[PDB]
């Protein structure tokens, strides 16, 4: 599977950034685990993760600072609570959890600029 996302996003004055993560090939019947990772000058750290299905389309309910809805071939992500120090590259990881066989893909990352 191939994962794509926009190259850059400017966060709002309220520290909110939204962007889509798309994967392919896709079917409406897929079950997918989506993780958002952050990269700065070093390792990629996990920000939030959720699992979506055909029926379970509203994700990240257990993270106050991530939201996401699953619509066909893409997840529409929103990250909140951002501060200037949070400027960095935000990568989508998409795992196809059902049906088998398993696949995992990484997006190229969306650079999020946050100005205080």
The candidate with the shortest Cα–Cα distance to 77, out of 116, 37, 24, 29, is: 37
Query: Least distance (Å) from Na ion to the CB of residue 108?
Result: 24
Alpha helices in 16-103 (DSSP H): none
| Residue with smaller CB distance to Na ion, 45 or 108 | 45
Q: Residues 43 to 72: which contact Na ion by CB under 5 A?
A: 60, 63, 67
| Cis peptide upstream of residue 25 (ω within 30 degrees of 0) | yes
| Cis peptide upstream of residue 32 (ω within 30 degrees of 0) | no
Query: Least distance (Å) from Na ion to the CB of residue 50?
Result: 8
Chain-centroid distance of CA 16 in Å reads: 14
| Residue with smaller CB distance to Na ion, 32 or 77 | 77
Query: Least distance (Å) from Na ion to the CB of residue 60?
Result: 4
12, HSE (Cβ side, Cα atoms, 13 Å): 9
Binding of Na ion at residue 110 (CB under 5 A)? no
Query: Least distance (Å) from Na ion to the CB of residue 13?
Result: 21
Q: What is the DSSP letter of 86?
A: G
Closest CB to Na ion: residue number? 60
| Residue with smaller CB distance to Na ion, 1 or 16 | 16
Contact residues: Na ion, CB under 5 A: 60, 63, 67
């Amino acid at each position: 599977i191939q994962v794509t996302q926009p190259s850059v996003v400017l966060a709002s004055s309220h520290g909110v950034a939204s962007f889509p993560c798309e994967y392919s090939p896709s079917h409406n019947t897929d079950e997918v685990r989506v993780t958002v990772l952050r990269q700065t000058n070093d390792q990629m750290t996990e920000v939030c993760a959720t699992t979506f299905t055909e029926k379970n389309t509203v994700g990240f309910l257990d993270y106050p600072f991530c939201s996401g809805t699953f619509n066909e071939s893409r997840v529409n992500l929103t990250i909140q609570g951002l501060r200037a120090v949070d400027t960095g590259l935000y990568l989508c990881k998409v795992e196809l959890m059902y049906p088998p066989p398993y696949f995992v893909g990484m997006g190229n990352g969306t650079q999020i600029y946050v100005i205080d």
